[PDB]
Amino acid sequence: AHEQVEPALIPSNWTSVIPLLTSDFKNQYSVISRLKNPNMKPVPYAGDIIKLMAFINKFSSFFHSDLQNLSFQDFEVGLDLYPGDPNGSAAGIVKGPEDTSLLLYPDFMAIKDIVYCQDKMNLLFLSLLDLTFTENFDGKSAKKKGPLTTWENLKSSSKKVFSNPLYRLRLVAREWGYPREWRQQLPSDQDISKPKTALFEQDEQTPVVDPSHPEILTPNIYTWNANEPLPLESNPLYNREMDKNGILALKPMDRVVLLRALTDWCASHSSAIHDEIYKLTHGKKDPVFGIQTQQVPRYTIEGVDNTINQFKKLCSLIQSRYEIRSKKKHFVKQLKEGKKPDLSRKLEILKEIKAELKNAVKSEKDELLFSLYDKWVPLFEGELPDQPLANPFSERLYKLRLQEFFLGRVPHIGDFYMPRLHSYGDSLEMSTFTDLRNLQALLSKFKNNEYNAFTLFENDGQSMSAQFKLFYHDTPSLAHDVARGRNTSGKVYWYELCHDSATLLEFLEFLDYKIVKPQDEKKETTDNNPSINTNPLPKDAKYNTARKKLQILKEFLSDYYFILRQFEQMKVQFADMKPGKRQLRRIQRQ
Amino acid sequence: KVLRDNIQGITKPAIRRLARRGGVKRISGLIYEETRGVLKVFLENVIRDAVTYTEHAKRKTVTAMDVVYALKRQGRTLYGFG
Amino acid sequence: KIKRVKMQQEALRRKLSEYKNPFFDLKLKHPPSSNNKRTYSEEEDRFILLMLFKYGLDRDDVYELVRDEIRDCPLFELDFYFRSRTPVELARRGNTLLQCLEKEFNAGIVLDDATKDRMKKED
Amino acid sequence: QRLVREIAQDFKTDLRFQSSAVMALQEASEAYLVALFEDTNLCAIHAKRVTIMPKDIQLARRIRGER
């Protein structure tokens, strides 16, 4: 209008790299496990592990470096959990096509490694006990610096380090609250929390001796039906072995439960971290778009292709906006007295690049964004402080609320989870968690495999979690249950997709079927589908954008596959800290 | 089935028994772990090469001859075992 | 103060009986916020008030109880801020929103709160 | 015997053991240990004390020349 007025970069559409998920998208029924296939496994215990890991990631400064490269598999083998069972762990895993026996991890891999993992989980357990209870000297203590627990600390001569913390914990636990599975659940289906236990009100006080106040503040009161914990002997907490034995004295699932619990009260009471988190998240700033629990990067929710299309559209619009901004009457007349240095350097450099970019052609129009993102960041000062396409993993405001092993949201299905490792402070050298540009660049370096296993571990690959798995989460069904009455006490919403490269390609194969748009909508994606995997989605145009995201993630997974299998072999090559110099002399000798 | 952590099965009273039979009167508390590690080392070397004999023998049962051969090669020839 | 919860009992009776899918329908933008770093988003709080009132205004232990649900809610275990908030602080929030619906319904709570009739006067 | 089994786990799986072998293992062990401590006492006595300390142990081990 005035000077083709600066098109307002509305935060709603033009965020930082950080959108939200709002968790109410599937208000319509989407419960069908049509995505089921042979390469799906019921894992009742995963998301618990997930919270474990994400917590550990956000608290890197608190934790040992050996903790920093831990993986899902570490915990599986170390904690003795096998997938398959809707009821916990399918004890043992069958091997090959048929198996009368089951793999029985020790009978399946080198045992020192299993021992090694177990020691890690004992170490983390002890460390968590410390962080919960070494709080008498809160946060800063005589041994202030570093994680509170070390290898020698567990390998110390106390021989029963677990004793006193266990004592402290069984003291504070009864009042700190219990999980359902460690609650003495009601046999009496009458002392539901909602009603009460017994009728303490023998009778209502109808004949008030004070008729002047017929109102009664004691109409009908009861005895209270608080949930109870188990008996102490029925409390696995009261099993003496952990004092010396450590965490490996239980049923596996119970171990899981106690770990989740230890995380629970650590977050609720480890006053150092407990204040630290609130300092970090409830400082003097709110989300750029509005306060919300769960958020992801932009390309994670939309994909590289659509986000770069929309952000090229954004780039063109905002470049025109800047050109408007400089030669603007009030702006010009306030420029000569120099309002802001950014309002000077930005304007001059944006003019030079308008000259050099009107030279750039429309085919170069798309490329100029990705070539000039380096100089483009300093442009966004008066604009959003962070790019609509920026690095999420540099924000102390989008730090607590962030979930990262999310890998994709898909309509009528749910969400796709990729626990890979820590990406905060430490573990950034090849951290897969980064800005879309340099992320895809690193992917490029590993499709052409410029960097390999030796380079991979030379560049902090040992502090890089070696292995992985792949999971899908059914948000629609669980949210529907929650908003519809809590049918669950032990129902499952996590399923496994692929643990390794071979299964990775298997599932890529299987998912390309889903990405096949419903040509069966004009029928008359594979055969034998109503039996083992519902490849043909129900015939409609609902999945069009769903399949766009599906193709996008297929792309993502192909891109990942290179580096993922590269780690998969780097570990095999370089599991042990070894003077690989002689290993390279192997090649130079040949 | 797995095994672990019997290095603690070497008790302090046994340790100080050995020390006494060695003619030592007074002992640091730090000695025990030191000893356990050193013993770990010794035992590892000896078992290692003993096994080495075992496999090249294509057997699946460690024999006392393999054991004696190993410590004799080390330099502590043990008599009394053929 | 005891009565204060009584019509708050009444007040929340209204709303949880009032909306149809309050976990996706509810509105408290009459008192959006007094003076706050407005950390808990609405639908989070919709659950809790749904959970608080599905207990009801027990004025005894609910804040203890919902923590357990937050300890146990599959969707709500996912927040960590929901955990480093003990029922003590949960009061601060919970009362606030009690007050928020209170102030939203301050023209609607007393609509069925403070009138009692007697035998011999037409009302 | 259990320590024997644990350590030997590492190199090959599912090994069997002569009990006689177990014995031979031990005698070798304790004799070696004995020589170790007696030298350790030599260290301590030359060091003008009567309580043994690990530095003596390690220094003797340095002397004999096992690295």
Side-chain angles (χ1 to χ4, degrees), chain A, chain B residues 2-82, chain C, chain D residues 1-66:
Chain A
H2 185 228
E3 287 109 345
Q4 204 270 332
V5 185
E6 307 196 33
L9 199 53
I10 193 66
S12 174
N13 275 343
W14 325 126
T15 62
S16 166
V17 66
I18 298 295
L20 74 164
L21 297 89
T22 302
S23 73
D24 58 359
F25 293 169
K26 291 303 121 175
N27 299 332
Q28 62 284 351
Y29 292 166
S30 310
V31 68
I32 303 299
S33 287
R34 58 172 67 103
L35 73 165
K36 184 265 289 181
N37 72 325
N39 296 75
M40 183 278 288
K41 293 207 174 66
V43 292
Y45 52 81
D48 216 329
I49 298 169
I50 301 299
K51 294 313 211 183
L52 295 174
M53 183 177 176
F55 184 92
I56 302 299
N57 175 22
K58 309 184 156 183
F59 290 61
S60 179
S61 66
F62 299 98
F63 293 135
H64 207 280
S65 61
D66 291 331
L67 295 174
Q68 293 179 176
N69 63 5
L70 294 190
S71 51
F72 195 92
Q73 284 70 240
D74 292 331
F75 293 159
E76 292 179 352
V77 166
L79 278 296
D80 189 358
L81 277 296
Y82 300 90
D85 187 13
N87 307 328
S89 176
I93 45 165
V94 288
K95 181 56 167 181
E98 56 90 19
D99 194 3
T100 62
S101 197
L102 287 76
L103 258 183
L104 290 175
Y105 305 113
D107 315 328
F108 172 65
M109 318 145 278
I111 55 174
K112 58 177 296 296
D113 308 329
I114 319 180
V115 169
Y116 189 73
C117 298
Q118 296 177 325
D119 297 1
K120 331 305 201 203
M121 282 73 74
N122 284 318
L123 171 67
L124 61 83
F125 182 59
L126 175 55
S127 87
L128 294 174
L129 273 189
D130 265 340
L131 298 184
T132 293
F133 285 161
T134 291
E135 299 305 316
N136 283 316
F137 296 98
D138 216 318
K140 304 152 281 313
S141 49
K143 187 268 183 181
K144 158 62 197 173
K145 281 307 183 181
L148 187 47
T149 301
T150 60
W151 282 120
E152 61 76 29
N153 191 184
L154 180 70
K155 308 197 187 76
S156 65
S157 61
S158 302
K159 186 182 171 179
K160 291 190 182 309
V161 297
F162 305 103
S163 162
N164 186 20
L166 163 61
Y167 169 74
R168 203 161 166 177
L169 189 69
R170 50 174 51 114
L171 293 205
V172 299
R174 181 68 48 162
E175 94 285 346
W176 277 2
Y178 275 25
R180 308 178 194 95
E181 193 275 330
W182 282 38
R183 291 179 181 176
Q184 188 181 58
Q185 295 305 145
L186 315 164
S188 60
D189 293 332
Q190 47 197 15
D191 309 330
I192 308 86
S193 193
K194 305 283 131 174
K196 299 92 170 189
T197 287
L199 183 64
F200 180 78
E201 197 59 80
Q202 312 86 44
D203 53 328
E204 203 277 334
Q205 302 179 4
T206 302
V208 290
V209 72
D210 190 9
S212 300
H213 304 74
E215 302 175 354
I216 180 62
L217 287 78
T218 304
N220 194 318
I221 57 172
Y222 275 46
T223 57
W224 277 121
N225 62 7
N227 44 20
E228 297 86 3
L230 275 297
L232 75 165
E233 58 86 20
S234 180
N235 185 353
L237 183 63
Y238 283 77
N239 194 1
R240 285 205 289 103
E241 289 77 312
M242 284 74 75
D243 288 344
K244 190 172 186 182
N245 168 280
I247 199 176
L248 322 168
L250 283 72
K251 205 177 82 79
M253 293 177 70
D254 279 334
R255 292 177 171 94
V256 176
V257 175
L258 62 83
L259 294 174
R260 169 166 45 106
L262 184 48
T263 61
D264 274 331
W265 294 273
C266 183
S268 302
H269 308 72
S270 306
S271 193
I273 80 170
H274 180 158
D275 201 11
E276 195 278 332
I277 55 167
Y278 282 99
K279 177 264 290 181
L280 189 153
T281 181
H282 289 352
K284 277 63 195 169
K285 186 51 179 69
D286 56 326
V288 66
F289 60 90
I291 318 170
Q292 195 69 18
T293 66
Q294 72 297 329
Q295 68 272 17
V296 305
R298 183 102 82 201
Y299 58 97
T300 61
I301 197 67
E302 282 169 353
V304 62
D305 289 10
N306 288 340
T307 195
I308 65 191
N309 273 16
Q310 186 175 3
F311 187 72
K312 284 305 302 186
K313 276 181 187 174
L314 188 152
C315 197
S316 175
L317 199 49
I318 61 173
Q319 289 154 347
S320 310
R321 183 175 207 269
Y322 312 141
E323 181 91 0
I324 298 321
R325 163 175 58 173
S326 179
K327 304 159 189 178
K328 164 189 177 177
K329 253 52 182 179
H330 183 67
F331 206 104
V332 161
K333 79 166 297 182
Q334 286 203 356
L335 273 171
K336 298 303 178 181
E337 57 187 6
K339 299 289 94 176
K340 314 287 176 181
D342 278 328
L343 293 190
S344 288
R345 309 291 77 74
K346 283 161 56 166
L347 299 188
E348 59 175 70
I349 301 299
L350 280 162
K351 300 322 170 283
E352 68 170 341
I353 67 168
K354 280 299 192 306
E356 307 149 38
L357 264 57
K358 265 58 189 180
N359 173 36
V361 302
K362 193 168 308 303
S363 306
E364 197 183 10
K365 173 189 147 187
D366 171 34
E367 180 57 34
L368 61 78
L369 173 81
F370 307 129
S371 59
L372 302 163
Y373 188 53
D374 46 15
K375 85 162 195 60
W376 192 263
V377 160
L379 306 193
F380 280 152
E381 311 309 316
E383 296 280 348
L384 312 184
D386 290 331
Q387 289 70 59
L389 299 196
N391 171 47
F393 315 90
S394 44
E395 322 291 338
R396 282 184 67 188
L397 73 164
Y398 288 113
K399 179 149 190 162
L400 183 140
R401 292 288 173 108
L402 187 66
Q403 68 275 16
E404 309 83 15
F405 312 143
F406 167 92
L407 183 63
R409 179 151 200 171
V410 61
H412 276 194
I413 297 169
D415 291 331
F416 292 161
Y417 292 165
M418 186 65 204
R420 188 267 181 275
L421 75 164
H422 178 73
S423 43
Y424 297 177
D426 189 358
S427 301
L428 276 297
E429 283 72 28
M430 301 185 178
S431 162
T432 180
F433 304 91
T434 183
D435 183 74
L436 167 69
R437 284 85 169 93
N438 63 7
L439 187 153
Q440 280 297 317
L442 203 49
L443 300 186
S444 80
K445 273 80 73 176
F446 282 92
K447 332 187 169 83
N448 62 7
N449 51 300
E450 309 164 11
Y451 294 100
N452 289 318
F454 55 110
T455 61
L456 185 76
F457 88 100
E458 284 170 300
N459 310 144
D460 284 8
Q462 313 291 105
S463 196
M464 261 304 317
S465 76
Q467 306 170 139
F468 75 98
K469 274 170 78 86
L470 183 62
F471 291 90
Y472 151 70
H473 199 185
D474 190 318
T475 60
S477 175
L478 61 84
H480 274 179
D481 271 322
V482 159
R484 289 182 308 100
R486 186 268 186 189
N487 279 339
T488 185
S489 296
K491 291 168 86 166
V492 175
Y493 306 113
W494 318 326
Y495 297 109
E496 191 255 338
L497 303 178
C498 64
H499 49 275
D500 75 86
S501 305
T503 54
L504 188 154
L505 302 191
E506 295 183 32
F507 182 76
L508 293 174
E509 187 274 332
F510 165 71
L511 62 83
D512 298 10
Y513 292 159
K514 260 59 185 181
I515 314 186
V516 172
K517 275 208 168 170
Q519 65 274 70
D520 198 85
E521 184 178 1
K522 304 180 301 294
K523 63 175 304 184
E524 310 287 347
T525 74
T526 61
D527 292 331
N528 268 338
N529 286 324
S531 67
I532 195 66
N533 54 3
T534 302
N535 274 323
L537 270 60
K539 35 183 168 300
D540 199 63
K542 260 167 274 184
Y543 314 105
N544 59 6
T545 185
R547 280 172 229 276
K548 298 192 190 314
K549 292 185 174 187
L550 286 184
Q551 198 79 260
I552 291 170
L553 276 296
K554 155 194 170 65
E555 295 156 7
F556 288 4
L557 295 174
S558 186
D559 299 1
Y560 274 139
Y561 175 60
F562 316 108
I563 184 63
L564 276 296
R565 77 162 180 276
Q566 181 66 221
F567 284 101
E568 291 198 326
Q569 176 52 221
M570 183 278 288
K571 173 197 186 177
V572 181
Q573 173 62 19
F574 290 140
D576 290 331
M577 72 292 291
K578 292 174 72 175
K581 62 202 152 53
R582 53 201 70 230
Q583 297 293 321
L584 276 298
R585 275 69 173 175
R586 288 181 179 177
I587 305 183
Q588 75 104 20
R589 178 68 180 86
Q590 285 208 32
Chain B
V2 65
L3 294 174
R4 63 188 289 93
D5 304 348
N6 290 139
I7 196 176
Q8 294 304 139
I10 301 299
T11 55
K12 181 179 182 293
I15 297 169
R16 65 195 297 102
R17 281 198 298 270
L18 277 296
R20 292 291 184 263
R21 177 170 290 174
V24 180
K25 63 172 75 202
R26 210 170 182 269
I27 306 177
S28 170
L30 283 72
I31 301 299
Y32 307 103
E33 212 65 21
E34 181 86 0
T35 61
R36 275 167 193 138
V38 166
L39 182 62
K40 184 178 179 181
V41 171
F42 193 20
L43 183 62
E44 293 179 353
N45 297 295
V46 300
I47 297 170
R48 194 210 319 297
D49 280 1
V51 172
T52 301
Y53 291 161
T54 300
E55 70 274 15
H56 178 84
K58 302 222 179 262
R59 284 186 275 98
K60 9 196 352 199
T61 300
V62 128
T63 48
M65 359 145 63
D66 297 334
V67 168
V68 163
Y69 236 72
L71 35 95
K72 175 240 332 266
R73 136 236 144 220
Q74 233 123 355
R76 20 243 44 115
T77 109
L78 183 59
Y79 282 173
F81 288 96
Chain C
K1 297 152 297 305
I2 319 298
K3 297 183 290 292
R4 176 175 197 275
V5 192
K6 289 176 186 291
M7 73 291 291
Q8 274 160 335
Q9 179 67 44
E10 164 50 42
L12 277 297
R13 188 272 300 163
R14 307 178 194 275
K15 177 52 91 187
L16 190 138
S17 315
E18 197 158 333
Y19 263 109
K20 279 76 191 177
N21 191 350
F23 193 54
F24 302 89
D25 292 331
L26 179 60
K27 183 54 64 182
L28 281 72
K29 258 277 161 187
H30 305 71
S33 304
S34 170
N35 175 10
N36 308 126
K37 175 66 179 301
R38 305 176 186 180
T39 54
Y40 315 85
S41 86
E42 160 177 332
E43 185 166 5
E44 318 160 356
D45 295 330
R46 307 213 302 269
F47 177 76
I48 79 182
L49 61 84
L50 300 172
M51 186 65 204
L52 293 151
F53 188 74
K54 181 267 177 179
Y55 304 116
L57 273 284
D58 198 65
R59 69 200 82 186
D60 169 28
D61 60 357
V62 181
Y63 288 160
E64 171 58 29
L65 306 163
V66 303
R67 189 271 289 159
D68 315 329
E69 315 318 312
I70 302 305
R71 174 184 312 278
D72 303 332
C73 190
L75 181 53
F76 268 90
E77 302 141 353
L78 318 175
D79 176 4
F80 293 160
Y81 167 62
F82 262 57
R83 302 185 167 283
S84 297
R85 296 290 183 267
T86 72
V88 170
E89 296 81 3
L90 294 174
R92 312 191 160 199
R93 174 65 167 198
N95 188 350
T96 300
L97 271 300
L98 180 62
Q99 301 168 357
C100 298
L101 184 136
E102 191 170 3
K103 307 162 288 182
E104 183 179 2
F105 282 174
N106 279 167
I109 310 168
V110 183
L111 169 62
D112 187 74
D113 179 24
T115 310
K116 46 171 176 171
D117 309 343
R118 299 298 164 95
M119 65 179 288
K120 279 310 179 65
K121 186 176 179 182
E122 304 179 356
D123 288 5
Chain D
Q1 180 176 124
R2 292 194 294 259
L3 271 163
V4 175
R5 298 181 183 277
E6 293 179 353
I7 288 183
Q9 284 181 149
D10 292 331
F11 294 148
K12 187 268 183 182
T13 43
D14 303 339
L15 182 62
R16 271 155 183 268
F17 283 84
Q18 284 184 348
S19 61
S20 47
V22 183
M23 295 298 102
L25 294 174
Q26 63 84 29
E27 295 84 4
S29 66
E30 293 84 4
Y32 183 110
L33 277 296
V34 161
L36 182 62
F37 323 121
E38 61 85 19
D39 291 331
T40 300
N41 203 212
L42 295 179
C43 288
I45 62 170
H46 181 81
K48 305 282 191 243
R49 285 183 279 104
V50 297
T51 307
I52 61 171
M53 187 66 204
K55 54 172 191 223
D56 294 327
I57 297 169
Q58 62 83 30
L59 188 153
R61 301 189 62 238
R62 297 295 87 192
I63 299 295
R64 188 270 298 164
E66 68 275 17

